Design a protein around this ligand. Structure first.
Ligand code: MG
Ligand code: MG
Ligand code: MG
Ligand code: MG
Ligand code: MG
Ligand code: MG
Ligand code: MG
Ligand code: MG
Ligand code: MG
Ligand code: MG
Ligand code: MG
Ligand code: MG
Ligand code: MG
Ligand code: MG
Ligand code: MG
Ligand code: MG
Ligand code: MG
Ligand code: MG
Ligand code: MG
Ligand code: MG
Ligand code: MG
Ligand code: MG
Ligand code: MG
Ligand code: MG
Ligand code: MG
Ligand code: MG
Ligand code: MG
Ligand code: MG
Ligand code: MG
Ligand code: MG
Ligand code: MG
Ligand code: MG
Ligand code: MG
Ligand code: MG
Ligand code: MG
Ligand code: MG
Ligand code: MG
Ligand code: MG
Ligand code: MG
Ligand code: MG
Ligand code: MG
Ligand code: MG
Ligand code: MG
Ligand code: MG
Ligand code: MG
Ligand code: MG
Ligand code: MG
Ligand code: MG
Ligand code: MG
Ligand code: MG
Ligand code: MG
Ligand code: MG
Ligand code: MG
Ligand code: MG
Ligand code: MG
Ligand code: MG
Ligand code: MG
Ligand code: MG
Ligand code: MG
Ligand code: MG
Lengths: 58, 159, 185, 60, 61, 172
RNA sequence: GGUUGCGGCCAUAUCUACCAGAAAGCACCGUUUCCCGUCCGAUCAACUGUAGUUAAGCUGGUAAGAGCCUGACCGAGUAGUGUAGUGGGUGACCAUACGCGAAACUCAGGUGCUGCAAUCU
RNA sequence: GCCCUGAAAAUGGAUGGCGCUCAAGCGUGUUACCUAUACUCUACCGUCAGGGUUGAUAUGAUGCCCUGACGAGUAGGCAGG
RNA sequence: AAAUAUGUAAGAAGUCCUUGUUACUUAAUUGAACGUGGACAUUUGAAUGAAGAGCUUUUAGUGGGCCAUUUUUGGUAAGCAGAACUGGCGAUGCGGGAUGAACCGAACGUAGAGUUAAGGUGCCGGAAUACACGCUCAUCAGACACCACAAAAGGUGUUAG
RNA sequence: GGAAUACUGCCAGCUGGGACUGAGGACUGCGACGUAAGUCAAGGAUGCUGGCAUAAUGGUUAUAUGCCGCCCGUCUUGAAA
RNA sequence: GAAAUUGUUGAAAGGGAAGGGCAUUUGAUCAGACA
C-alpha cells in the first residue's frame, strides 16, 4: 500500500488565503534577552529621572 | 536515511572566499554596534563560536542587545502564513553595519537642506523621488554623421 | 467574469440593531438613530452603537470607577454616561455629587449616588438634556476582566489558566508544569 | 480629458477618478486569427502603439 | 509637424519624445493566469476582459 | 507575414556623456506595418552590433516608395534561409513591378518550395538587374524573348448559378 | 621626501634576476660578570654602544619577466535564462516574439595607497 | 521540398462521416463570414454596500425611498422559509 | 559566474539642537540607555492599487489525491515510480478539440439586442465550392496542437537551390 | 516644374436603410432654440389609425418536427460503465 | 376505499427500447380581460 510521500502543492495557495501577515511593529519593543547588567542599572536610572520629573512638579 | 544537521547543506556557503582565508582583519573588531543599528548577517566559517544558522545568511536585522563580544540581532522569520520574531545572538564577526539605509539617511540630510535652501529662498521645491521618466524630443545631426547602412549576412562556417 | 479581489457579498460584521428584544431598548435605539442621523454630533453615533452591544461587550461600570473619572483634570462637573448597568462599590468612602446616565442602576449604585446628592438619569433624559451630549463623559467597563478571557490563547509558555474543573494539586500541576516532572510548559 | 492626455501634475487623481472603462469586443473583429501572440507576430497582445486607437474605437 | 520638417530641412532627424501616456486593454479572460501577472493585472484595475484604463508611463510602470 | 512596405529605419546607441553623437545605422526593412519594421531593425542590429533596443534609440523610420512602379523589372534576390537540418544561402530572381511586390512573392516561394516560414528567412539583398543576359534564371529569361506572345488554352468561365443550361466551352 | 615605533586596507604589497642607496635610523656586529635559556650565548637572556660593516637585512630602480590589480561596443548582445504561441520537427531538438544577460578570449594601462608619533642632509 | 521505397496481424471500418486531385491536399499570404453560460447596452430577481426619511391629520420603522457593485460550487458552515 | 527567485530600507515611531537620571561604563559627567526643553508639516519625502484596516472567540469538513507546461530523480521503457514552482481537474457546467475528468476558449441569477473567443465556413452543418503565389499524382496519396506514432537508409519522380 | 491620386488619420460635417428596447409616473435638474411670448429631441414613448372583442391572443396538454439529453444512489484520483 | 397492478370503453403514437430539454405546427381543453 504505498502512497504519496510529500508535496508542497497548494500550500502557498493557503498561506495567501488569509495572509502572510506583515510582521507587526511596536514602538517600545521589549527588553527581553537584553543584558541584565544593563537592565539592572537602567531600572535605577529611570527611577531616578522619574523621581526628578516628579520633583519638577512641586 | 536523511540528514538535516545544524550546518547541513552549507558547503560553499560558509566557505571562505578565494585567497581570503586566514585571520579576520582587525577592523572587523574595531567597528562599534549600538542598539537599533541595522546589520547584515553573513557567517564567517573560520569563526565557529557564535555563528548564525544557515537560514539567517544574507539576512538583515536590527541590533536589540549589546554584550561583551556579541550583538543580539532580531530577525523576522516567517513560518506558515506569518512572521515570528527571532532574537539571534551573533558574534561581531558574522555582522556588518548595513548600507541598506544610508541612501535614505543621506537623502534626508540632503532633503532638509534644499528645503531650507528653498524656504529661505522663495519656496518652490519638489523633493520626492520620481522614477525614470521617458526622454524628451531631441534632434540628431548629420554633420560628421551619415547613417551607414547594414544588411544581414550570409551563412558561413570557419572550422 | 471578474478576477475578484475580495469576498463577494460580505456582511459588514457589525450589529445594526440590538440582538435583544426589549421594546424599551428598541425605543432608546429609536431615539438615538434619529439623533445620530440629524445632529452630526459624534457622541450620538457612539451611543447608538453601544446600545447594540451584547452583554459581554457591556461590562458594568462601578460607582467607584465613576468617582475616579470625575477626579480627572477638569471633569468633576461633567455628566458621566454609561451604556450598561452601573453597580455599587462598598470600597469608596467618599462619593461625589454628579449626574450619571445609564441603562440600569443597581439598587445600591443608585442609592450611593443619590445619598451623595447626585442624580440617576435614563439615556433618554440624557438626550433631552444634552442632544449633542454636551458636557458628557462616556465610561466603559473592563471588557477583559471576564473569566472567560482567562482561557483564551491557551498553549505552551503562554501562562494562561487551563480549562479545568476541580483544581488543587493532583490537577494538572505535574509533568509539563515543573522542571522535575519531564519539562515545564 | 485634458489632465489625462497631457498627463498633468494631477494625473494620479484624475485617472483614478475614472472607473476602468468597460468596452465591448472589437466590432469588426481582431484582424488576427489568433489573439494570444504579440502584435508583431501577427497576434493581438503587446504594445501596438498608435494602432491601439483603431482597435479601442471598434470596441468602444 | 514643423519640427520634423525643419529638421529634414537642416539635414537632421527629429526624434519625438517617447510617449508619456499609454492605454491598456485586458485581452485575456479570467482564468489560468499565473500569480505575478495576475497581481499586476489587478493593480492596474484590469480584472475583467476588455475593460481598460490609462497608464502614465515611467520605468516603474 | 503580410502585404509589405519597405522602410528605411535608423537607430543609434543612446548617447553617453563621453560619447555624445553615436554612429547612426540604416536598414531597409520589408515589413507590413512599421511596428514590425522597428522590431526587425533591432533584431538584425543586435546580430551585428553591441546594442539592444534598451540601450539604443530609433532615430527615424520612413517608407521608401518604389521609384518606377509601373516599370517591369527583373529582380535578382539574395536570401539566407533556414531549413530543418541546417541553414543556407540562396539566390533567386523575381520579375515584377515593385520591390515590395517582389518581396511579397519571395516569401510565398520560400514557403511553397522550401517550407520556409517568415521567421526563418533573411533578405540579404534585393536589387534590380540592369542588362538582360545578366539575368541568370531560366524561368525568367523565358520572359524576355523578343516579340513574345502566348495563348491561354482551356478557358474557365466562372459560373454564377448552380445550374447551367448550356454545357461549357473552354475556347479562348 | 628618507627612516623608525605602532598601524589600516591586505600582492598595484607577492615571485624571479640584476643594479643603486647620501644623511640619519634600522640593521648586521662586540661581550658573558649579572637575571635568563640552550646538546650549542645560533635562537632566547643579559652587558657595551665601546671594537667593526653596508656584505646582507631594509628601501628603491631595471625586466617585449611570472603573478596580481584596473579598463574596453575585444569577444558577445555570444552562451545561458524569465515570459508567449493550436510555432517548425517522427523525434532529438530548433527557430521566432517581449525582456535580462555571462565566462573564457583578445588588446590597453598599472605594479602598494595611506594614519599617528619621533627623527634626519 | 512534396511524392514514392523502406512499411508485417488477427470480426468489417474509419482525415468524425461522405467524398475531394489547377482540392474539399501540403506551405504561405489577404479579405469576408458563422457562433459561448464570455464582452457591451437594457429589463427583472436575489445578495452585499452606501445615502435619505418618525412629521402628523391612515394602512407594514424588522418599514418606505435613492443609488452602486456582485451572482460557479462537492465536503462543509450559516441563514430565511 | 548569470537569468528567475530572495533579506532590508524608502521618515512624525522622522532628522537635528539644548543638557537631566544611574548602582552600569569611562582616566575622566567619559559613555551607554531613558528622559526634560527647543527648531522644521504634508512634494512629510518613489510607483500602482486599496468595496477599508486591525483584532478576538469558537467550530465543520479534510488529513487516499490526480493532471498539464517548465525544472527534475530512478527505470530500456510505460497511460510506470518519485520531487520543484505555478496553473488546473477533483468540487464545474458553457463554446471548441467528432468522441474524452485535466488541452484550447471562457468560469454560470432570469432574459432581449449586439460583438466576439478558441475553432470553423463543399455536403452532413450555422458560415466564401472566396481571393492569391507555389508545391504534390501515391496499383496502400494526404488532410491541423495535446492526439491517438513510425526510423536508418534509398529514388535518373518532380520542384527549387 | 505643377497638379492629381493612393494610403493613414481627423471633423463637437451632412445623410439613408434595418433591428431590439420604451424601465420611470405631478412638479423639482443640467441644458438647448428664441429679440421676445414661447418652444424643445434637455433627469426613460408618445401620437394617429385599424382589426378582434373572442379561443382571436394566451395557458395547459397530447402529438409531430429541428437541434440537444447515457442510470440514479455510492465509494472513488477517476462510473453511463 | 390511495398506490403498484388489471378488464372494458374513448383518444393518440409507434421502421432495433421508452422517457427528458428549448422551441413551434396541429388537435383537444381552459382562465382572464373586455363593455
Ligand atoms: Mg499501507
Ligand atoms: Mg500509486
Ligand atoms: Mg498521505
Ligand atoms: Mg542525504
Ligand atoms: Mg522525521
Ligand atoms: Mg595564510
Ligand atoms: Mg566549543
Ligand atoms: Mg478575578
Ligand atoms: Mg465598424
Ligand atoms: Mg464593415
Ligand atoms: Mg459583422
Ligand atoms: Mg484558426
Ligand atoms: Mg460599438
Ligand atoms: Mg492606472
Ligand atoms: Mg526605390
Ligand atoms: Mg650610515
Ligand atoms: Mg653561564
Ligand atoms: Mg652573539
Ligand atoms: Mg637578546
Ligand atoms: Mg649593496
Ligand atoms: Mg627591518
Ligand atoms: Mg608582467
Ligand atoms: Mg529561455
Ligand atoms: Mg511548444
Ligand atoms: Mg542555439
Ligand atoms: Mg492516416
Ligand atoms: Mg471535413
Ligand atoms: Mg491553404
Ligand atoms: Mg466574400
Ligand atoms: Mg445570459
Ligand atoms: Mg451560489
Ligand atoms: Mg463563490
Ligand atoms: Mg522582491
Ligand atoms: Mg487609490
Ligand atoms: Mg473604501
Ligand atoms: Mg478549524
Ligand atoms: Mg483533524
Ligand atoms: Mg481517509
Ligand atoms: Mg494547465
Ligand atoms: Mg473525492
Ligand atoms: Mg471548468
Ligand atoms: Mg481528435
Ligand atoms: Mg495558454
Ligand atoms: Mg453525415
Ligand atoms: Mg451552410
Ligand atoms: Mg507540432
Ligand atoms: Mg529521407
Ligand atoms: Mg528529391
Ligand atoms: Mg412607460
Ligand atoms: Mg413606464
Ligand atoms: Mg374566454
Ligand atoms: Mg375570432
Ligand atoms: Mg411529451
Ligand atoms: Mg445525441
Ligand atoms: Mg459504493
Ligand atoms: Mg479504484
Ligand atoms: Mg454514477
Ligand atoms: Mg368497502
Ligand atoms: Mg390522447
Ligand atoms: Mg411544449
Amino acid at each position: 500500500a504505498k502512497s504519496k510521500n510529500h508535496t508542497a502543492h497548494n500550500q502557498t495557495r493557503k498561506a495567501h488565503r488569509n495572509g502572510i501577515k506583515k510582521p507587526k511593529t511596536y514602538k517600545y519593543p521589549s527588553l527581553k534577552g537584553v543584558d541584565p547588567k544593563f537592565r539592572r542599572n537602567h531600572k535605577h536610572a529611570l527611577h531616578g529621572t522619574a523621581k526628578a520629573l516628579a520633583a519638577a512638579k512641586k | 536515511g536523511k540528514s538535516h544537521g545544524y550546518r547541513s547543506r552549507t558547503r560553499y556557503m560558509f566557505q571562505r572566499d578565494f585567497r581570503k582565508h586566514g585571520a579576520v582583519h582587525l577592523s572587523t573588531y574595531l567597528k562599534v554596534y549600538k542598539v537599533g543599528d541595522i546589520v547584515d548577517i553573513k557567517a564567517n566559517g573560520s569563526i565557529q563560536k557564535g555563528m548564525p544558522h544557515k537560514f539567517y545568511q544574507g539576512k538583515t536585522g536590527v541590533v536589540y542587545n549589546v554584550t561583551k563580544s556579541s550583538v543580539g540581532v532580531i530577525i523576522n522569520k516567517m513560518v506558515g502564513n506569518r512572521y515570528l520574531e527571532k532574537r539571534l545572538n551573533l558574534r561581531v564577526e558574522h555582522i556588518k553595519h548595513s548600507k541598506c539605509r544610508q541612501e535614505f539617511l543621506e537623502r534626508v540630510k540632503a532633503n532638509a537642506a534644499k528645503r531650507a535652501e528653498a524656504k529661505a529662498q522663495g519656496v518652490a521645491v519638489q523633493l520626492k523621488r520620481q522614477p525614470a521618466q521617458p526622454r524628451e524630443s531631441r534632434i540628431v545631426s548629420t554633420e560628421g554623421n551619415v547613417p551607414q547602412t547594414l544588411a544581414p549576412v550570409p551563412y558561413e562556417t570557419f572550422i | 467574469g471578474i478576477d475578484h479581489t475580495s469576498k463577494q457579498h460580505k456582511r459588514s460584521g457589525h450589529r445594526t440593531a440590538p440582538k435583544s428584544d426589549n421594546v424599551y431598548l428598541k425605543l432608546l435605539v429609536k431615539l438615538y438613530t434619529f439623533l445620530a442621523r440629524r445632529t452630526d454630533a459624534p457622541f450620538n453615533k457612539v451611543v447608538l452603537k453601544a446600545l447594540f452591544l451584547s452583554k459581554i461587550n457591556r461590562p458594568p461600570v462601578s460607582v467607584s470607577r465613576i468617582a475616579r473619572a470625575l477626579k480627572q483634570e477638569g471633569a468633576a462637573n461633567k455628566t458621566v454616561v454609561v451604556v450598561g448597568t452601573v453597580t455599587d462599590d462598598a470600597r469608596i468612602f467618599e462619593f461625589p455629587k454628579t449626574t450619571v446616565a445609564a441603562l440600569r442602576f443597581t439598587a445600591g449604585a443608585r442609592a450611593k449616588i443619590v445619598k451623595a446628592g447626585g442624580e440617576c438619569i435614563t439615556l433618554d433624559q440624557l438626550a433631552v438634556r444634552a442632544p449633542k451630549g454636551q458636557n458628557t463623559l462616556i465610561l466603559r467597563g473592563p471588557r477583559n476582566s471576564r473569566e472567560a478571557v482567562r482561557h483564551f490563547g491557551m498553549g505552551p509558555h503562554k501562562g494562561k489558566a487551563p480549562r479545568i474543573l476541580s483544581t488543587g494539586r493532583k490537577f494538572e500541576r505535574a509533568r509539563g508544569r515543573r522542571r522535575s516532572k519531564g519539562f515545564k510548559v | 480629458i485634458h489632465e489625462i492626455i497631457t498627463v498633468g501634475p494631477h494625473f494620479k487623481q484624475a485617472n483614478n477618478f475614472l472607473w476602468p472603462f468597460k468596452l465591448s469586443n472589437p466590432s469588426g473583429g481582431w484582424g488576427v486569427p489568433r489573439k494570444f501572440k504579440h502584435f508583431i507576430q501577427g497576434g493581438s497582445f503587446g504594445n501596438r502603439e498608435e494602432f491601439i486607437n483603431k482597435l479601442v474605437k471598434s470596441m468602444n | 509637424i514643423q519640427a520634423k520638417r525643419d529638421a529634414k530641412a537642416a539635414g537632421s532627424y527629429y526624434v519625438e519624445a517617447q510617449h508619456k501616456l499609454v492605454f491598456v486593454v485586458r485581452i485575456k479572460g479570467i482564468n489560468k493566469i499565473p500569480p505575478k501577472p495576475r497581481k499586476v493585472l489587478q493593480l492596474l484595475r484590469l480584472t475583467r476582459i476588455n475593460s481598460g484604463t490609462f497608464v502614465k508611463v515611467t520605468k516603474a510602470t | 507575414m503580410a502585404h509589405f512596405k519597405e522602410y528605411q529605419v535608423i537607430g543609434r546607441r543612446l548617447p553617453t556623456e563621453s560619447v555624445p553623437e553615436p554612429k547612426l545605422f540604416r536598414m531597409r526593412i520589408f515589413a507590413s506595418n512599421e511596428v514590425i519594421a522597428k522590431s526587425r531593425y533591432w533584431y538584425f542590429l543586435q546580430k551585428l552590433h553591441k546594442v539592444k533596443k534598451a540601450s539604443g534609440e530609433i532615430v527615424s523610420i520612413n517608407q521608401i516608395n518604389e521609384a518606377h512602379p509601373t516599370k517591369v523589372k527583373n529582380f535578382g534576390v539574395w536570401v539566407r534561409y533556414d531549413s530543418r537540418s541546417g541553414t543556407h544561402n540562396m539566390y533567386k530572381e523575381i520579375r515584377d513591378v515593385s520591390r515590395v511586390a517582389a518581396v511579397e512573392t519571395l516569401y510565398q516561394d520560400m514557403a511553397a518550395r522550401h517550407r520556409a516560414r517568415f521567421r526563418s528567412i533573411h533578405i540579404l539583398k534585393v536589387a534590380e538587374i540592369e542588362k538582360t543576359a545578366d539575368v541568370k534564371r531560366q524561368y525568367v529569361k523565358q520572359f524576355l524573348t523578343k516579340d513574345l506572345k502566348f495563348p491561354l488554352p482551356h478557358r474557365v468561365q466562372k459560373s454564377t448559378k448552380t445550374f447551367s443550361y448550356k454545357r461549357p466551352s473552354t475556347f479562348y
